[PDB]
Structure formats: structure tokens, C-alpha cells
Amino acid sequence: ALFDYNATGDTFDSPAKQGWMQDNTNNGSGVLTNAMPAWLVQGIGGRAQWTYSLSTNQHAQASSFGWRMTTEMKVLSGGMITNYYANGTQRVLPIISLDSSGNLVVEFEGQTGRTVLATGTAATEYHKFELVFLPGSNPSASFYFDGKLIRDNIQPTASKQNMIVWGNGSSNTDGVAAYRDIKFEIQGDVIFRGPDRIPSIVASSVTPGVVTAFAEKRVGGGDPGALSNTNDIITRTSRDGGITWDTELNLTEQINVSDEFDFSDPRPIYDPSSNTVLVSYARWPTDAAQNGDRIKPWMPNGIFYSVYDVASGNWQAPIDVTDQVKERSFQIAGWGGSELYRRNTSLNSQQDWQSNAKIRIVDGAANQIQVADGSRKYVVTLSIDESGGLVANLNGVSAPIILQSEHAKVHSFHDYELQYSALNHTTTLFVDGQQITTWAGEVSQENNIQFGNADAQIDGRLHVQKIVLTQQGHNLVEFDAFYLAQQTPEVEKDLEKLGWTKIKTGNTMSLYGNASVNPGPGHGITLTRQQNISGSQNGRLIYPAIVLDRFFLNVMSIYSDDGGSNWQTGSTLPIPFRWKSSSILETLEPSEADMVELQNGDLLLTARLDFNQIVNGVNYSPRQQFLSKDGGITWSLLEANNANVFSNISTGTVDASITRFEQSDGSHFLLFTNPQGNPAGTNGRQNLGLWFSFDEGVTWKGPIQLVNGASAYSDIYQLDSENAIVIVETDNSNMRILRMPITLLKQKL
Ligand SMILES: CCC(CC)O[C@@H]1C=C(C(=O)O)C[C@H](N)[C@H]1NC(C)=O
Ligand SMILES: [Ca+2]
Ligand SMILES: [Ca+2]
Ligand SMILES: [Ca+2]
Ligand SMILES: [Ca+2]
């Protein structure tokens, strides 16, 4: 909430015409002045000041969420120039004056001594005076003069005064000052009310002042997937930098006509090229979702986006991108074991045959597709090498073959075709129609087609969409995992019931997946520093989404290199595992995540780690950072870069936010928000903190406490050259707006 006085020239320029109450005594007075229009306070032989009354609830909001008072004035003479705020019990009182040398000085009630602010002709010229109050158990204000920190940790002092005040607050002491502008802002206006939840926010650089915020509208409350709620995506827009907001708009009820769905996790990206907001969100059937792993691949989970045209205020109807981002496959994780499927066949080695296998290599090695024709065996083994390239080894041939070096292509599906020539008794491998090589395989009496992960001592994971075997104009074998993966449970999908033999050693997991994809909470980004990042590009839209294969959550990039027309997925985060007992996996589950592009084009990602945090005695904490050096395709776990780097961060699991802040001089740093807990560094969703990184995410300074009270999910975005805007869940999950003077606050560090 903003309470202000602005002199414009309009002879409404009286503070009285702008809601202020004249409070003069004796000969105290005031008059409009126009050097540039201003109100001249004339506290000559009397008091001359202006006041504004606030409600109990307004004072309480100010106490819980902070406030700031900004004055542009010049002091002409005298003293007791008192611009301040008093809430009925306490106040922070700066007293500004000209001293006996004509120097402009300030002193504070409750602190010792004075500070010179300006000397010479500067003392009686206009300046900008800012008081910023940060809430907390032991709260304090800081005072700034033309943007520079003058005094910090100014603790409030007792006063029964109850008003916003500016001018010359003394009858017995002359003071004369001209005011161009007074702004008192109470932080924390409610923008979305609980039990709505899960906020995100972005701001338009092309149209300064435009801010677009999102949440889940939860009729009935609670997470998606409950029969007792119908959840939609809602949005509001500000055009004055987040002070006022237009009408709450339900973006998804138009595609939720029978309340058959829940939508969740609005993830906006601001696009400066089109000046648009593209917000992606999850769809779920209303009665099943991510919680409990209840969502299944045959159910209508997917991802849609809506586009806001900032220039017109138009919201475009939702667009479904589920087919592009929700993989359908049979997945074999040969992690600590091997798992192969073999279909015995009756190939005639004296006739040609052909096979096709559509396969994605997720990680590792010993991933195989094999055909044996009763005379010879042909095996292609697919691995990820040290530099993250895709490599083929053929049985009987010493030299490996590099198939791909570009990381997106390394982990995408490819068609592996074997063409056997009876005449030469050799087989030619084609990959995506490209002839790769010809080899003779090995002698064998086996007669089958076989695929999976082949070695219990070599970890690998491969996903399969199609397998075909053909001879003499007939398909002998056909397996369409892409089709089967999305069928309901009454369609037979068990390979062992479909004529395949399962050959498993040790511990493995396999499944048809994925069960769901979810953009996750917060916003995404457009990349602009990718020039020297091989295989990547500027203009990429990207966000870190949550994928559930069947039972385990993890994070992968979802991105578009054509402005949002077509979307692609990257690899999931690399995480440790351990089999604590047969078929019981100890591992991590990264879920709610946020990423930022560093100065060198590397991407820094911070992820909430849910459920178990400990693998082989190693505690990864409730939060873990990851780094991508290839534009978001693949990631690396940053050792010892977890919750530990955010001093006094809360110890409970919760969504966080991260973003880049750029100053007018081109300097930059990172901002991060998360509760501290109360006390700081304990469990609760209380006391939102702000952390800074001036070194590309290696260390973090802070926190600066932003909120005194409930603080759960949050999102932070740069608002302008000097401010960041924060949306944060608070009491009863009520989402509130903070507008934080970052360039001021950083000076407290
Ligand atoms: C994925 C993180 C977590 C796993 C327990 O679930 C989230 C936690 C939440 C929470 O801790 O408050 C609320 C989120 N809306 C929920 N996500 C979904 C899709 O229901
Ligand atoms: Ca409805
Ligand atoms: Ca529901
Ligand atoms: Ca987030
Ligand atoms: Ca699970």
C-alpha cells in the first residue's frame, strides 16, 4: 500500500488535496512553490507538518512485512525537519537540520551523535532521503542519502504517536524545507488469498511497470489430485510496478468445463522478444496426481501453456504440449543389476533380415540391442562416454564408434536398424537412416532378438519405444512400447506375457513411463549468455520441471529453441543410489527447482530434495545445487554446495526462488529467497530470508530477513534497476507482495 504526496504543478498540489492532514501551530504555514513544483514547509514561529492516519491492521502489516519511506526535499534553513512513521507504540525518528555551519546533518532518537550528509551549496539542494524498515524479533531501520547507506540498525524507540508525518515537527524550533515527493510504502499487500497457493512472478523489461503473477486457485483447498478440490491457474497483472493489481483471472476453467481436472504449478517465462509472458502449468485428473505416486501414464496428466500479450493485455487460450514433453516408453534401469528381454525366433540365416529398435540412452553402458539368426549373433552396445558422448561398440569389433557428441542428441531417441545380407553373411548398422558400418558379428546358435541392460556390474539405463524384426516380407517380432505405455491397465503390457523371456540378475527397475511431468513452482528464464556454450543458443526458453517415472521424482529441463512453438526435454539430474535390501532403493528425489544463468552461460540450479536425503551415509540436506555447462541438457551435482551454503536457511523442505539481478552500471549478482525458520536455521516455514551471491553461486551472503511471521513458498524477480519484487505465501498461505530496494539493502552486508 502506497501513501504519498506528489507536487505536480496542478494548483491539487496541496497535500490536503492528496489525503494529508495539516498540523500547524502558531505562525507555522506552507505554500506551493515552483522553481519544478514543491510544497514549501514554513515552520517559522510554529509547527508546520502534514500527517496521515493508519488503521490497526495497516500498522500490523507494516510490522510484519516491513515498510519504506522515501522523501525528496531540500532543507532551506533551521531544523527539526522530521519525516517519520509512528505506529502508536514505537517510531524510528531521524531529525534532519542545518547545523551552525550550514551543513546538512542527521541525528536519530535512540542513537548517539550526528552525521553530516552534505556540505556547501549541496546542503540546501534537493536530495533523496530513504528509511527502510526490516521486520523481525529485534527489528531495525536503515537510513540512506542519495542512495548511500548512512546509518544502519536503527532500533525503534517508544512513542504513543500514531501517524505518518513530514515537515517541521516543532513549535519552538524553526525549520524550512521544500518537498517534491513523499512516499510511505507498507510492504506485503495480499494479492492471492489462502487456500490458493504456489506463487510465481515475472516482470516485463520492454514495458516498465508491468508485472504478472500466478497461483493455483484451489476450490476446496490442498494439493492437486484430491476429489474434494477443483484446482485452476489464476493470474493478476500490475501496470504500476506491483502496487495495484487487476482482476483475478482463472486461465484454465475454459478447459476444465466439468471440473474433471486439477491444474498446478504455474511456471511463467517472460519473453522480451515478443514482450509476452508464457506460463506453463501441469494438468491432472482431478482425482489423482503426484502425491502418493497415484498418477499413472494412462491418465490425463500433461503440460499446457497460456500466452499473455503484454501490449494488449490479451490472454491466449491454453496450448497442450504434452506429446512433446511427456515421454512414453518402456524403461530399464540396469543400476546394480542387469535386465534383458529375449524373444526366441526362427530367422533363416541364408535369407536377408532387418531389425529396427528405437532407443534412448539415459545413462551408463552395457545397453544392448541384439539379433541372432541361428548362425551368427549381432550385438550393438550403447554407452555414454567420459565427455558425455554417445558411443557404439559392436561385438567382435575392437574399435568403438562415436555416434553423437552433441549432448541433446546423445540422450534423444535414435533408430537403430540392422540390415543383414545373407550373400555377405554380414550386417550393416544404420542410425536414423545414416549408414554407420558393416560387421560379421560372432558365431552363435542362438536365434532371437534381445534388448535391455546386459551386465550386472555395469550401470546403464535405456528407454525403448519400438522393436521390430522382419524377414521375407513378414514382421516376426513387434513391440510398440510407445503405444503400450499410455494404455489403461486392461491392455496387456507385461513383456513376459507378450512372448518375451525376462533375464534379470541382481537388482533393477523397469516400467512403462513416464507417469507425469510437472513444470514445478516458480518461474523460468530465457538464455542470453550462450555464445560460447556448444550445442546451446541464445533465446532458449527453459524451466526445470519435475518428472515422475513411476515411483521416483527427479528434475529435467524443459526448453524451446523456437520461441515456444516446440518443446524438448533434457536429462534428469545425476544422483547416487544404493540398494539397502532387495528391491529397496536408497536414493535422492529432487523436485521443486529453480535455475539461473550465470555470467559464463553455465546454468545454476537449486532443487528441493524430498523424502530421503541420505545416500550411503552421505547427507545431501533439504536442498542441493547442480550445474549445467551445455545449456541445460545435462547437469552435475555440485559437491558440498547444498543447504549448507545458505547460512541460517530453514531445515525443512520447501520451495525456494533464485534470480539474477543487474545494476544500472552493468554489475550483477544472484538473489535467493527461502524461509529461515524461527529461530533462524530451524525447521519452520517462517521468516523469509534473502541471500546474495556475488561470485556466481560459489558462496552466499546473508540472509537479510524480509518477513516477520509465516513464510513458505516464494518467488523473486527483478523489478527495475534498483528493486526486486517478491511474492510470498504467509499467514493461512496468503500470498503477499514485497517490493525490495535491493541496491539499498545490499549495503547492509
Ligand atoms: C513435489 C514436492 C512435494 C512432494 C511431497 O509436493 C509438493 C509439496 C508442497 C508443500 O510442501 O507445501 C506443496 C506442493 N504443491 C506439492 N506439489 C504437488 C504437485 O502436489
Ligand atoms: Ca470450475
Ligand atoms: Ca481435484
Ligand atoms: Ca521455486
Ligand atoms: Ca514415490
Residue numbers in the entry: 51 to 61, 63 to 86, 89 to 802
The paper states:
NAs are also present in other biological systems, for example bacteria, and these non-influenza NAs are critical virulence factors in many pathogenic organisms including Streptococcus pneumoniae, Pseudomonas aeruginosa, and Vibrio cholerae. The viral enzyme is a mushroom-like shaped homotetramer, while the bacterial NA is a monomer with two flanking lectin-like domains. Both enzymes share the canonical six-blade β-propeller fold of the catalytic NA domain, despite exhibiting a relatively low amino acid sequence identity of only 12% as revealed by structure-based sequence alignment.
The bacterial VCNA, on the other hand, is only moderately inhibited by the reference compounds, displaying IC50 values of 144 µM for oseltamivir carboxylate and 52 µM for zanamivir. A common feature of viral and bacterial inhibitor binding is the electrostatic and hydrogen bonding interaction of the carboxylic acid group of oseltamivir carboxylate or zanamivir to a cluster of three positionally conserved arginine residues (Arg224, Arg635, and Arg712 in VCNA; Arg118, Arg292, and Arg371 in H1N1-NA). Moreover, the acetamido binding cavity in bacterial VCNA is sterically constrained by the short amino acid stretch of Gln317 and Asn318 that extends into the active site. To rationalize the observed increased inhibitory activity of zanamivir over oseltamivir carboxylate for bacterial VCNA (IC50 of 52 µM versus 144 µM), we compared the inhibitor interactions in the determined VCNA complex structures. The 4-guanidino group of zanamivir, for example, forms electrostatic and hydrogen bonding interactions with Glu243, Arg245, and Asp292, whereas the 5-amino group of oseltamivir carboxylate interacts with Arg250 only. The hydrophilic 6-(1′,2′,3′)-trihydroxypropyl group of zanamivir hydrogen bonds with Asn318 and Asp637, the corresponding 3-(1′-ethylpropoxy) group of oseltamivir carboxylate, however, interacts only hydrophobically.
